[PDB]
């Protein structure tokens, strides 16, 4: 008949598909909450994410890419950072206020250094 079919298949599956599947999904999500990889990609400093970052760095330093990539350090893009600073030094000496005692490398060290211990990647003793 018309009713038969979906009746038997439903009596088998609808209890399964709703009860068993949804309850298993809820229980597995609660387990995933207590799992070590709980939202690992969105929790800063998580073990899986940090290991992935380390392995990405290892692959980048072991298999150099012929194409140029976005520099993680914006100053790391420079093909010759030495020449960059040497020019800065020459320009600064050209426009130094009188016999100023301030040099370019000290200023670059002062600007690059920063005391932000509470920023992560620094709270992980890194």
């Amino acid at each position: 008949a018309y009713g038969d079919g979906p009746k038997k298949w439903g009596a088998v599956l609808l209890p399964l598909t709703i009860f068993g599947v949804g309850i298993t999904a809820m229980g597995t999500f609660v387990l995933y909450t207590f799992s070590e990889d709980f939202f690992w990609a969105f929790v800063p400093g998580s073990k899986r994410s940090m290991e992935l970052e380390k392995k990405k760095k290892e692959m980048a330093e072991k298999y150099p890419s012929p194409v140029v990539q976005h520099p993680a350090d914006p100053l790391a893009g420079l093909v010759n950072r030495a020449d960059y600073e040497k020019g800065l030094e020459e320009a600064w000496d050209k426009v130094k206020p009188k016999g100023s005692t301030v040099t370019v490398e000290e200023k670059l060290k002062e600007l690059s250094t920063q005391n932000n211990p509470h920023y992560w990647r620094n709270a992980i003793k890194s």
Binding site: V43, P44, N116, P117, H118, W120, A123
Partner: protein, 86 residues
């Protein structure tokens, strides 16, 4: 831990220090303002994020800025009283 920063525009009011309910801001000597003192935040881990320090800063805009980081909540940042995570 909600990152809290101090900028050059700080004029050593000490109001941000007095407004902090968890002793995050702290007055260090400096040579950038007439007060010869500048706020610092060495105990950001205690910052709840209430932004009372920003309410008490008299500069044109906030010489002390509290950047809420909801993806890095802490029992000290969440102000937990009945749950301990330590």
């Amino acid at each position: 831990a909600h990152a809290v920063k101090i900028y050059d525009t700080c004029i050593g009011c000490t109001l941000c220090v007095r407004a902090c309910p968890t002793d995050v801001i702290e007055m260090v000597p400096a040579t950038v303002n007439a007060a010869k003192q500048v706020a610092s935040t060495p105990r950001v881990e205690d910052c709840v994020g209430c932004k009372r320090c920003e309410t008490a800063c008299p500069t044109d805009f906030l010489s002390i800025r509290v950047y809420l980081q909801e993806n890095e909540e802490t029992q000290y940042s969440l102000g937990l009283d009945l749950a301990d995570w330590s």
